[PDB]
């Protein structure tokens, strides 16, 4: 089991960490959502699906920088919604093919009433999402740590 990002980098068997840059809507008002869909960027596969089933959860989602201070949010993982930052590990998604399949995670972030001006700075760390992988074969229990960075400034009009 390993993962990669689109035109990007890879995290190999056994886990590790990688940096991911996302495009964000440049202007977002109170009451609106920034939607950050990682399922178009992060892809994973099972290396021996004929005998092994891989189980994959969102172990934890954490907010940083402008997102931590200026937004509240929710995360959608494989069809279900949760608070973001997260309050517990999600249920598991099964990976049973050598063909790349998206990691089905999306953040929905909305400005708090005190956000104004530049609420997220270009290039800044905005979130960490930890993918936890196990299987039905041995004791493997691995973390794939995705550091999520803003590509551009996000302004909350005042």
Toward Ni ion, which CB reaches closer, 70 or 133? 133
Toward ligand J73, which CB reaches closer, 54 or 84? 54
Q: Which stretch binds Ni ion (CB under 5 A): 19-27, 45-53, 87-95, 141-149?
A: 45-53
Q: How is residue 156 written in tokens? A: 């909350």
Q: Which stretch binds Ni ion (CB under 5 A): 44-52, 78-86, 125-133, 139-147?
A: 44-52
90 binds, among Ni ion, ligand J73, none (CB under 5 to 8 A by kind): none
Length of the chain equals 158
Q: Which stretch binds ligand J73 (CB under 6 A): 30-38, 43-51, 68-76, 101-109?
A: 43-51
**Residues β-bridged to residue 93:** 56
Kind and range of the H or E element at 144?
Answer: strand 142-150
Q: How is residue 21 written in tokens? A: 């840059």
51, 113, 139, 158: residue in contact with ligand J73 (rule CB under 6 A): 51
Q: Please state, in angstroms and rounded to a whole number, the distance separating the CA atoms of residues 137 and 127.
A: 32
Contacting ligand J73 within 10-39 (CB under 6 A): 13
CA-closest candidate to residue 44, choices 5, 79, 16? 5
């Amino acid at each position: 089991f390993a993962c990669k990002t689109a035109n990007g980098t890879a995290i190999p068997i056994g886990g590790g960490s990688a940096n991911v840059y996302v495009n964000l809507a440049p202007v977002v008002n109170v009451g609106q959502n920034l939607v950050v869909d990682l399922s178009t960027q992060i892809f994973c596969h099972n290396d021996y699906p004929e005998t092994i089933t891989d189980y994959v959860t969102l172990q934890r989602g954490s907010a940083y920088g402008g997102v931590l201070s200026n937004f509240s949010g929710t995360v959608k993982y494989s069809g279900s919604s949760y608070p973001f930052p997260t309050t517990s590990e999600t249920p598991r998604v099964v990976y049973n093919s050598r063909t790349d399949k998206p990691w089905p995670v999306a953040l929905y972030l909305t400005p708090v009433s005190s956000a104004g001006g530049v609420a997220i700075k270009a290039g800044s760390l905005i979130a960490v999402l930890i993918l936890r992988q196990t299987n039905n074969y041995n004791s493997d229990d691995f973390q794939f740590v995705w550091n999520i960075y803003a590509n551009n400034d996000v302004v909350v009009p005042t």
